[PDB]
């Protein structure tokens, strides 16, 4: 006892007590907390890296997979075949490639080229290059993953230093080194940590496995954590495997009172000074050498062999954990210690051999005790999540040390169970390695990969490029031409209708005007009072009047009686019943005109279809509904299309306002044109405002190029089948629908709502402008998004919400973009018409979709600016409605009449 006694008193600091271990444990417990909290994560040494593995295998994984295993004692490559539906469970073959020391400490390129080459040599032997086999990647180092197939190396550990790897996505680095060879293709579907990998392996045979553990070259552990506790992953649903990365633990001085002069000296010689402190006390790469240090310290101090000391004893890595194992064999325990200590030059006496074996013991035990301490924390953590007095769980393990040490396994277990009383723990040992597990994750990885591929492959058809966009503008131009040239006007889709407004306001418009605003999302009667001269003012009041669905789709007689009805009421409300006033009629519909106060409804659009209106002069329909009353009489000087009225309202300000745009229920644009070009109206003196009716753009197929299965469906089920094609790809009355139909599809395809087509989802109108704008709203939270959707009647999860958002984004974007190419063609024509090399024009705007969308206006403006660089366009948003612009046309009407 003399010998052993002294040593124990010597290496006292390396013998941890249950008291202390409990201490250590409570620490790691905090470290896990701080590694999970969004607030303290950026400082915690224990990182708790999310891994995007949502659970251990559920048996439903089949296919042929290839798995890479790098970072372990050996670089292994495997092929895993899993076929339950075919009486074949798990077969796997592997080959271990050598990777020389230079390769591991050299340039990243060497490394990943070396890997790709091996993968090439591997696939060549199995003659499988021609098989699209999903590839998993076991990369045993800490990684920043935002998705399972992305691995941003945070920092090398153990035996690896490769230049130009840290802070990079190894998934890419490899993809890269793979492409430079050319010998094959690799679909690297997922990258996993060896703990995760091992946990998945073990959990394949044990439905209770909730933790992976590695006690090999390095040491780390991964467990299953509640998403509610993972701050760094938007969600609260289910579980995900966290990769604690505990080697780092105490790297912030946290475990200084535990580290010893030996742990500090072993460090100052490590490949990554200051880091992986906890690891350098536990894992196999260190234990042996950690001994060699103590030994030397002693021998110099006369505690060994008369104090002799050979160069071999002083040499680095002359005492491997391997030797540290044999010295712990009871059968050869001391015997082995003889052969080892003999080969080290020193003269090993029988007492010595005992002394040494004891050091080993103290060391080996500490690592074992340490890991027990932390693994205990994890265990307690898992139990707390269940809220049950006891906890049962399996723990997959691996690590050359664990496997080959004769005491470690046993001691570690003993100590652990002692430290976590209220729980039964199973330690299943992985004999195949993390390979089987990798492939199991790679299965779910690739299964999800495919779903995306399809989704994107679909949404792709909504991606318009700078070129496609130019082309649209170009055509838009062409269509404008056809619409103007009376020769082709009849067969032209873009009608380029004349509004009979010849000049923007000049500031003399004076008087009182009754205005009607119909066609939008709100029918309303307006009263506008304008003053001109020294001080100019524009007072105005208005009332909204609902139009019942029946009436909107009843008959012209009724509708227009309902109008004149409201017209009358508003006259009361205003107390101006009596004198016969002039009225500006804002009718939002393609109307053929011959004068300002005459307009024949060419066709219904948007939501309206009232019978016996088309082909009529709406002014007449009106004057006729009034006559059918007689309560009052008034002079409708003008019928104005809202694009035009809008413009005028804005050109009020704003003399360079020569263009009107509307993006709301419907989409449409007007502008000033030189009479010489307006072939459909006599004259070539002065200008003229043109109501483009660009909605019809593509009603001849000139857009069938970029139109999708979804656009078509929406068009088909519309009231105006085959008409206003353009519009139906822009305005709010449609965009929602476009999306709805995509979703439906995506749903049957199995991508949403677990394949359940909500009754609701079968409802048209769901995705209104209002709602559509809330979703895309920036920096919104998944719970928020999922909320907005739950309020529609859509039982959707986060994942779901991510997709719906993504979809709405695509649809609204293409909208803003298409709209842009439109405006682009307009302004650029104007510029060329006037022969300028650069043009400064402002565009008046109105329409809810535009007002309420988070990105529409922006996405679109950027588009106009990019297509028509020679144009500099402003976008003044109208806030008062058409009323004002309408009354300004009315006045010039009453005037020109008298004058």
Ligand X SMILES: OC[C@H]1O[C@@H](O)[C@H](O)[C@@H](O)[C@@H]1O
Signed CA dihedral, 803, 806, 809, 810: sign only: negative
Pairing of strands 871-877, 839-846: parallel
> Does 263 show up as a binding residue in the annotation?
no
Asked if 537 interacts with its own copies (CB under 8 A), we say yes
Q: Is 503 helix (H, G, I), strand (E, B) or coil?
A: coil
CB 177 within 8 A of CB 186: no
Segment near ligand X (CB under 6 A), from 25-33, 96-104, 165-173, 639-647?
639-647
| Binds ligand 0WK (CB under 6 A): choice among 846, 864, 867, 871 | 846
| Binds ligand X (CB under 6 A): choice among 642, 658, 737, 828 | 642
Residue of 323, 617, 642, 699 marked active site: 642
DSSP class of 871: E
CB 277 within 8 A of CB 56: no
Asked if 561 interacts with ligand X (CB under 6 A), we say no
| Binds its own copies (CB under 8 A): choice among 26, 43, 388, 611 | 43
Quote the CA–CA distance of 408 and 404 in Å, as a whole number: 9
Concerning whether 524 is annotated as a catalytic residue, the answer is yes
CA distance to 222, 709, 720, 834, 876, per residue, from 604 (Å)? 64, 25, 8, 34, 29
Pairing of strands 391-398, 152-153: unpaired
Query: Nearer to ligand 0WK by C-beta: 108 or 399?
Result: 399
Quote the CA–CA distance of 416 and 395 in Å, as a whole number: 12
| Binds ligand X (CB under 6 A): choice among 260, 336, 430, 643 | 643
Query: Nearer to ligand 0WK by C-beta: 250 or 399?
Result: 399
Asked if 665 interacts with ligand X (CB under 6 A), we say yes
Rg of the chain taking only CA atoms, in angstroms: 39
Quote the CA–CA distance of 606 and 668 in Å, as a whole number: 12
Segment near ligand X (CB under 6 A), from 3-11, 129-137, 188-196, 812-820?
188-196
216-245: which residues touch Na ion (CB under 5 A)? 227, 230, 233, 235
Asked if 396 interacts with ligand X (CB under 6 A), we say no
Q: Which residues of 695-732 are buried (b: 16+ CB within 10 A; e: fewer)?
A: bbbbbeebbeebbbebbebbbeebebeebbbbbbbbbb
Task: Please state the closest distance from residue 597 (CB atom) to ligand X, in A.
Answer: 17
**What's the distance, CA 735 to chain centroid?**
21
Task: Please state the closest distance from residue 298 (CB atom) to ligand X, in A.
Answer: 29
Query: Nearer to ligand X by C-beta: 22 or 168?
Result: 168
Residue of 364, 588, 718, 857 marked active site: 588
| Binds its own copies (CB under 8 A): choice among 128, 154, 334, 574 | 574
Proportion of the chain in helix, strand, coil states, percent, rounded to 5: 45, 20, 35
Task: Please state the closest distance from residue 899 (CB atom) to ligand 0WK, in A.
Answer: 27
Asked if 219 interacts with ligand 0WK (CB under 6 A), we say no
> Does 733 show up as a binding residue in the annotation?
yes
Asked if 662 interacts with ligand 0WK (CB under 6 A), we say yes
Out of ligand X, its own copies, ligand 0WK, none, what residue 134 binds, judged by CB under 5 to 8 A for its kind, is none
Asked if 35 interacts with ligand X (CB under 6 A), we say no
CA distance to 102, 173, 762, 797, 836, per residue, from 163 (Å)? 12, 12, 56, 42, 57
Asked if 73 interacts with ligand 0WK (CB under 6 A), we say yes
For residue 792, give both structure tokens: 């529609």
Query: Nearer to ligand 0WK by C-beta: 328 or 828?
Result: 328
For the CA atoms of 373, 374, 378, 383, the dihedral, rounded to the nearest 10 degrees, stands at 10
| Binds ligand X (CB under 6 A): choice among 141, 204, 500, 585 | 141
Asked if 438 interacts with ligand X (CB under 6 A), we say no
List all residues 6 or more positions away from 627 whose beta carbon is below 8 Å from its beta carbon.
Answer: none
CA nearest to 853, candidates 767, 740, 775: 775
**What's the distance, CA 400 to chain centroid?**
40
For residue 173, give both structure tokens: 């680095």
CB 475 within 8 A of CB 175: no
Task: Please state the closest distance from residue 438 (CB atom) to ligand 0WK, in A.
Answer: 8
Concerning whether 642 is annotated as a catalytic residue, the answer is yes
> Does 120 show up as a binding residue in the annotation?
no
Asked if 314 interacts with its own copies (CB under 8 A), we say yes
| Binds ligand 0WK (CB under 6 A): choice among 50, 284, 584, 844 | 284
List all residues 6 or more positions away from 751 whose beta carbon is below 8 Å from its beta carbon.
Answer: 451, 454, 455, 803
Residue of 475, 524, 725, 740 marked active site: 524
Q: Is 837 helix (H, G, I), strand (E, B) or coil?
A: coil
For residue 230, give both structure tokens: 């993972």
Quote the CA–CA distance of 420 and 391 in Å, as a whole number: 10
Quote the CA–CA distance of 472 and 335 in Å, as a whole number: 87
> Does 97 show up as a binding residue in the annotation?
no
Asked if 882 interacts with ligand 0WK (CB under 6 A), we say yes
For residue 515, give both structure tokens: 């205005």
Residue for token pair 């020391």: 101
> Does 69 show up as a binding residue in the annotation?
yes
Asked if 678 interacts with Na ion (CB under 5 A), we say yes
> Does 163 show up as a binding residue in the annotation?
no
CB 220 within 8 A of CB 282: no
Query: Nearer to its own copies by C-beta: 417 or 529?
Result: 529
CB 269 within 8 A of CB 316: yes
Task: Please state the closest distance from residue 688 (CB atom) to Na ion, in A.
Answer: 8
In SS3 terms, 587-614 reads as: ECCCEEEEECCEEEECCCCCCCCCECCC
> Does 868 show up as a binding residue in the annotation?
no
Asked if 285 interacts with its own copies (CB under 8 A), we say no
Residue for token pair 């430290």: 419
Concerning whether 381 is annotated as a catalytic residue, the answer is no
Asked if 577 interacts with its own copies (CB under 8 A), we say yes
List all residues 6 or more positions away from 499 whose beta carbon is below 8 Å from its beta carbon.
Answer: 593, 596, 640, 641, 644, 670, 688, 689, 690, 691
Asked if 428 interacts with Na ion (CB under 5 A), we say no
Quote the CA–CA distance of 184 and 130 in Å, as a whole number: 8
684-713: which residues touch ligand X (CB under 6 A)? 693, 695
| Binds its own copies (CB under 8 A): choice among 774, 796, 812, 868 | 774
Asked if 483 interacts with ligand 0WK (CB under 6 A), we say no
Asked if 15 interacts with its own copies (CB under 8 A), we say no
CA nearest to 426, candidates 213, 110, 231, 238: 213
Asked if 715 interacts with ligand X (CB under 6 A), we say no
CB 496 within 8 A of CB 480: yes
> Does 158 show up as a binding residue in the annotation?
yes
| Binds its own copies (CB under 8 A): choice among 182, 302, 311, 835 | 311
For residue 137, give both structure tokens: 């990647």
Out of ligand 0WK, its own copies, ligand X, none, what residue 575 binds, judged by CB under 5 to 8 A for its kind, is its own copies
Query: Nearer to ligand X by C-beta: 47 or 259?
Result: 47
x-marked contacts with ligand X along 782-821 as a string, rule CB under 6 A: ----------------------------------------
Pairing of strands 537-544, 239-243: unpaired
95-154: which residues touch its own copies (CB under 8 A)? 101-102, 105-107
Q: Which residues are annotated as a binding site?
A: 15, 69-76, 140, 157-158, 193-194, 217, 220, 245, 276-279, 330, 398-400, 410-411, 434, 517-522, 588-589, 605-606, 641-642, 665, 667-668, 693, 727, 732-733, 769-773, 846-852, 882
Q: Which residues bind ligand 0WK (CB under 6 A)?
A: 69, 71-73, 138, 140, 194, 197, 214, 216-217, 284, 398-400, 433-434, 517, 519-522, 586, 588, 642, 645, 662, 664-665, 732, 846-848, 881-882
Active site residues: 524, 588, 642
Q: Which residues are annotated as a binding site for ATP?
A: 15, 69-74, 330, 410-411, 517-522, 665, 732-733, 769-773, 848-852
Q: Which residues are annotated as a binding site for D-glucose?
A: 140, 157-158, 193-194, 220, 245, 276-279, 588-589, 605-606, 641-642, 667-668, 693, 727
């Amino acid at each position: 006892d003399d010998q052993v006694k002294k040593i124990d008193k010597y290496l006292y600091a390396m013998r941890l007590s249950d008291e202390t271990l409990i201490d250590i444990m409570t620490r790691f417990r905090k470290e896990m907390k701080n590694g999970l909290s969004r607030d303290f994560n950026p400082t915690a040494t224990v990182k708790m890296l999310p891994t995007f593995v949502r659970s251990i295998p559920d048996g439903s994984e089949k296919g042929d997979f290839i798995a890479l295993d790098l970072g372990g004692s050996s670089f292994r490559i495997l092929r895993v075949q899993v076929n339950h539906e075919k009486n074949q469970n798990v077969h796997m073959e592997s080959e271990v490639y050598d990777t020389p020391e230079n390769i591991v400490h050299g340039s990243g390129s060497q490394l990943f080229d070396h890997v790709a080459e091996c993968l090439g040599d591997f696939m060549e032997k199995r003659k499988i290059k021609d098989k699209k086999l999903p590839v998993g990647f076991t990369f045993s180092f800490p990684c920043q993953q935002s998705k399972i197939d992305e691995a941003i190396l945070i920092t090398w550990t153990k035996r690896f230093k490769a230049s130009g790897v840290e802070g990079a996505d190894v998934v890419k680095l490899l993809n890269k080194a793979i492409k430079k060879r050319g010998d094959y293709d690799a679909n690297i579907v997922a990258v996993v940590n060896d703990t995760v990998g091992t946990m998945m392996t073990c959990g394949y045979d044990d439905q209770h496995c909730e933790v992976g553990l590695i006690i090999g070259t390095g040491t780390n552990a991964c467990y299953m954590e509640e998403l509610r506790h993972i701050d760094l992953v938007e969600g609260d649903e289910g579980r995900m495997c966290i990769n604690t990365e505990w080697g780092a633990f105490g790297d912030d001085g946290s475990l200084e009172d535990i580290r010893t002069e030996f742990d500090r000296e072993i460090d100052r010689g490590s490949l990554n000074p200051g880091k992986q402190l906890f690891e350098k006390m536990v894992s196999g790469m260190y234990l042996g050498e950690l001994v060699r240090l103590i030994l030397v310290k002693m021998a110099k101090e006369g505690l060994l062999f008369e104090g002799r000391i050979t160069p071999e004893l002083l040499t680095r890595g002359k005492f491997n954990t391997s030797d540290v194992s044999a010295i712990e064999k009871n059968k050869e325990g001391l015997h082995n210690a003889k052969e080892i200590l003999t080969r080290l030059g020193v003269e090993p006496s029988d007492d010595d051999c005992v002394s040494v074996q004891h050091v080993c013991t103290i060391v080996s035990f500490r690592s074992a005790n340490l890991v027990a301490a932390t693994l205990g924390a994890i265990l307690n953590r898992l139990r707390d999540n269940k809220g049950t007095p006891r906890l049962r769980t399996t723990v997959g393990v691996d690590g050359s040390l664990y496997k080959t040490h004769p005491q470690y396994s046993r001691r570690f277990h003993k100590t652990l169970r002692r430290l976590v009383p209220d729980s039964d723990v199973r330690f299943l040992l992985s004999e195949s390695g993390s390979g089987k597990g990798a492939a199991m994750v790679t299965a779910v990885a690739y299964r999800l990969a495919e779903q995306h591929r399809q989704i994107e492959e679909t949404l792709a058809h909504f991606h318009l490029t700078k070129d496609m966009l130019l082309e649209v503008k170009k055509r838009m131009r062409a269509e404008m031409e056809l619409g103007l040239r009376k020769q082709t006007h009849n067969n032209a889709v873009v009608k380029m209708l004349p509004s009979f407004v010849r000049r923007t306001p000049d500031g003399t418009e004076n008087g009182d005007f009754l205005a009607l605003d119909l066609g939008g999302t709100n029918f309303r009667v307006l009263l506008v009072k304008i003053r001109s001269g020294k001080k100019r003012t524009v007072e105005m009041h208005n009332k909204i009047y609902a139009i019942p669905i029946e009436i909107m789709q009843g008959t012209g007689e009724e509708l227009f009686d309902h109008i004149v009805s409201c017209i009358s009421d508003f006259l009361d409300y205003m107390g101006i019943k009596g004198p016969r006033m002039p009225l500006g009629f804002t009718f939002s519909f393609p109307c053929q005109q011959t004068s300002l106060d005459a307009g024949i409804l060419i066709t219904w659009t948007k939501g309206f279809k009232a019978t016996d209106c088309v082909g009529h002069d709406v002014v007449t329909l009106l004057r006729d509904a009034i006559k059918r009353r007689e309560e009052f009489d008034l002079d409708v000087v003008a019928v104005v299309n809202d694009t035009v009225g809008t413009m005028m309202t804005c050109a009020y300000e704003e003399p360079t306002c020569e263009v009107g745009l509307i993006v709301g229920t419907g989409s449409n644009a007007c502008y000033m044109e030189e009479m010489k070009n307006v072939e459909m109206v006599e004259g070539d003196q002065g200008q003229m405002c043109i109501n483009m009716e660009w909605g019809a753009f593509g009603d001849n197929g000139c857009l069938d190029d970029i139109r999708t299965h979804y656009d078509r469906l929406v068009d088909e089920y519309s009231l105006n089948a085959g008409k206003q094609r353009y519009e139906k790809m822009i305005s709010g009355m449609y965009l929602g629908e476009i999306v709805r139909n995509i979703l439906i599809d995506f749903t049957k395809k199995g991508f949403l709502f677990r394949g359940q087509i909500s009754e609701t989802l079968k409802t048209r109108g769901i995705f209104e402008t209002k709602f559509l704008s809330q979703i895309e709203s920036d920096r919104l939270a998944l719970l928020q998004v999922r909320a907005i959707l739950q309020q529609l009647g859509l039982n959707s999860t986060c994942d779901d919400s991510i997709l719906v958002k993504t979809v709405c984004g695509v649809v609204s974007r293409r909208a803003a973009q298409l709209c842009g190419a439109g405006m682009a063609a307009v302004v650029d024509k104007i510029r060329e018409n006037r022969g300028l090399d650069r043009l400064n024009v402002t565009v008046g705007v109105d329409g809810t979709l535009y007002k309420l969308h988070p990105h529409f206006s922006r996405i679109m403006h950027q588009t106009v600016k990019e297509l028509s660089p020679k144009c500099n366009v402003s976008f003044l948003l109208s806030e008062d409605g058409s009323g004002k612009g309408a009354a300004l046309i009315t006045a010039v009407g009453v005037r020109l009449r008298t004058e």
